[PDB]
Amino acid sequence: GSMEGILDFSNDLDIALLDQVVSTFYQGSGVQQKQAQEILTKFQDNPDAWQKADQILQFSTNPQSKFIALSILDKLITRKWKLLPNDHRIGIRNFVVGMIISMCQDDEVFKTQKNLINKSDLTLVQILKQEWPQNWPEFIPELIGSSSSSVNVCENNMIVLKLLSEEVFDFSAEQMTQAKALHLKNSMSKEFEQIFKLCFQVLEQGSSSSLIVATLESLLRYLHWIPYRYIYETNILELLSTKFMTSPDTRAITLKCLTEVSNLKIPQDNDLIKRQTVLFFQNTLQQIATSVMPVTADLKATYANANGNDQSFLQDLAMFLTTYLARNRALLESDESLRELLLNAHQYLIQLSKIEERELFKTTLDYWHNLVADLFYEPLKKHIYEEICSQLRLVIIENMVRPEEIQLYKSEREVLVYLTHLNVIDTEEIMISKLARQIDGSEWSWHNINTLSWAIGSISGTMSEDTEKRFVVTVIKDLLGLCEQKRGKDNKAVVASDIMYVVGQYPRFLKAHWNFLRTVILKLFEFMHETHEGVQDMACDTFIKIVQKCKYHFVIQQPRESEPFIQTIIRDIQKTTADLQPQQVHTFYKACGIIISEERSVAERNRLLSDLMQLPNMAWDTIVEQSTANPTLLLDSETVKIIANIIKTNVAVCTSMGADFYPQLGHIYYNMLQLYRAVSSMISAQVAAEGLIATKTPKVRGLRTIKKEILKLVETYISKARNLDDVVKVLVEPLLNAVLEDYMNNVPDARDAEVLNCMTTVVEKVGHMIPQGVILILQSVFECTLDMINKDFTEYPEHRVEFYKLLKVINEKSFAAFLELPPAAFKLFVDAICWAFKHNNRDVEVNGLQIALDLVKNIERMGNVPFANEFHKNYFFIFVSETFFVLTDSDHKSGFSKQALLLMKLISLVYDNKISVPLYQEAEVPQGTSNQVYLSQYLANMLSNAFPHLTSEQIASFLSALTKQCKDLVVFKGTLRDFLVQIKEVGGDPTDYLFA
């Protein structure tokens, strides 16, 4: 409609048309809002729009339209500022300064348009970043002076200074050059004395709390960088720790200042500073106890009620206490007059640790770790904290988390192990009595018995063996008693699981007591028949868990047994696993494989292996004989399931046995590869008959599962294989014949990416022994896979990833295969690497850059031969420029380090004269010219065309620096980062590249 009129800049801008378009955005909806959105975007991104900003600041009455006007100004200041004439720079400064003063003098505007004031202040700071102090030396004196006149201007000057400190010290690293950062840092440092007088004066003499809060907000930022003397050699610690902790508006921010004060860089050998560090802590804790809550207060309840900013305050208090005590608790541990202070502060942390809030708990748990670790190692320190640690035991136990939440559980276990060592008796007592309160029913629930079980299991291996024996027996008896007492299948299942959980966490006890181990395992077998949800998984998981740790006790003959128990498991294996689902059976077989790998007599291991594999070897043989006599049977989905499950059972046993799996692989190997071909035919047949949609059907997916599990079995064995001669002479040739041609000759949607994966492993382990085999792999998968993945970045994601892993390992282990490629296909290899650079997907990007880097190294290693000379003539400048393209386009930032390293390597080759031939075609440049000189000219030309807003001086300076610094990587990276900043703006200083 009429809204699009504002895109016409030939006319004067209609302010009422702007404010309504802006209103339609911030208060409207639907098609109306979406239309205004695209107009404000197109208005803002018009490069002339900044000229029509002084107009809006005066004439408009909408704060949003003014905000948007300043955003357009901000964009000009950071990006095009140095291109303006000197008068436009001064003109803009003046009406930004003037708008701020006039908004501060009007109390109505100062209260109600805080968003528009803060935005103006930020826009002022962007001028300072361009113009201060070199073209504005009187800014800080004029700021301090104007703060006398109006209390509102004083407050806003504290917001300006806060933002200035943020932009110079906290966010400069990425956003400005190294040299500009240092200049601005030195400049703020030079005049901070004068800034600190005004700040300390306002905090001493001021009564306006909104002014005081803003002043403390600025102090928080100053504390990141200022020298310690400003805090210690003035009164300011007393003020923070007493005056400002009493009032709640200032408390929040003061507490954050003291947290940062606790981290200040301080001399550690001065007694007066130690007392000052003790004092501010003493004062702070005193204010908390008298003005906020006493030590005994239920912080869990307070936090859960969530009144005002209580949650944030208790968070900040935990951060203050943990930070200070981690650094300074030693100061309070010797003097007996400071003992109450030490224990009170720790008692607050105990109460904070009871808060129901996961991320807060982590914060306090990090501190408890730091403390109890120190009590475990540091002498004469644990007696001090005996009452704190006893309370901590109960807190950790009651908040214990399942092993599945890995980071939290690990942290909790570590703390609880330390606390168990510090006082085993106390830990035992708390756990036994917690268990008694499950038996009497006063704390009984599924969650509560579970959490206690996870805690009791976590401290395994910390007690003496004798103490552990008494403790485990007592826990198991009580838990067994608990199960008998409880009524219903749900209740008894929960307790049986926990019984089984604890048992699996105590292998030392299982190892010493064979009779008990046997009973447990037989019980798990009974539980493998229970249909109740989760029980069968629990039984299987516990079984493999016990076996991983106690395997040796299954493989030997125990006294009073006729045979090793592994034989006994293998006998009833059908009856034992009959009611399990297929992957539960596979875990069972894998567990048996762990045990069998312990037997070191070859003949006995092999006998156990074939006995274990009896069922799947009999089912296998009756399917080979059936389905090879008539391929019709493989369409029967039930037969496909049976075959996949045989291969899966083989994978599972191969996973735990590795090199020891070889004889079993041999029983099935040749028929399995024949099955792979018969299955391959079926798949191509259904694709022709039914179409590409056939690859989605249950029958084709079932067949492909057979292929993938076969590839997975072979990869698994080969990855762990000890006898590489057998791998090459027996396994490899039949594998390549079975898989490569089938892959090459299928349509893209029927190619299994698992083929590439399997080949990666084969080249990794035995590539060095099969050079003609690696060549055959390349020919079969290279061009056909590259064509699947070189039209966009999205399609065939698995193939894409496995493709670049395969080339990576070929380039390391058998580089000769790339030499034998005809030049046309070698050109595609280079194309394929550069294509990998341009990916966002991290797995592809990282390998692309690594392959490039390794390829360059491979060519360097060839020396002064025609292939190296011709590689450099054809591809050196391609790699330099394609690397440069991703360094500078702002869409491959995740790969900076690897890009920089590759670029540094390429530049260093010319710097050390390690490219023998010239990189230029004859008579393009004078005849005697070094590659160094021509590298500089190619690069200067390349960057002038790519970034035409850079001056020739900028480009030449950047290149001198970059090439001189191609031995020191960290400095090189700095120079690259400086270039990345300067390309985002106009008029960057070329001297900036002399920083290092």
């Binding site: 027996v473 198991i476 067994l480 219903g488 049986a496 009779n515 009973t519 447990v520 019980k523 229970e530």
Partner: peptide, 18 residues
């Protein structure tokens, strides 16, 4: 005997009521 008496009790652990 304390370990043996616990082992015996373990043997009769069940999920069923009757």
């Amino acid at each position: 005997s304390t370990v043996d008496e616990m082992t015996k009790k373990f043997g009769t652990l069940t999920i069923h009521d009757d």
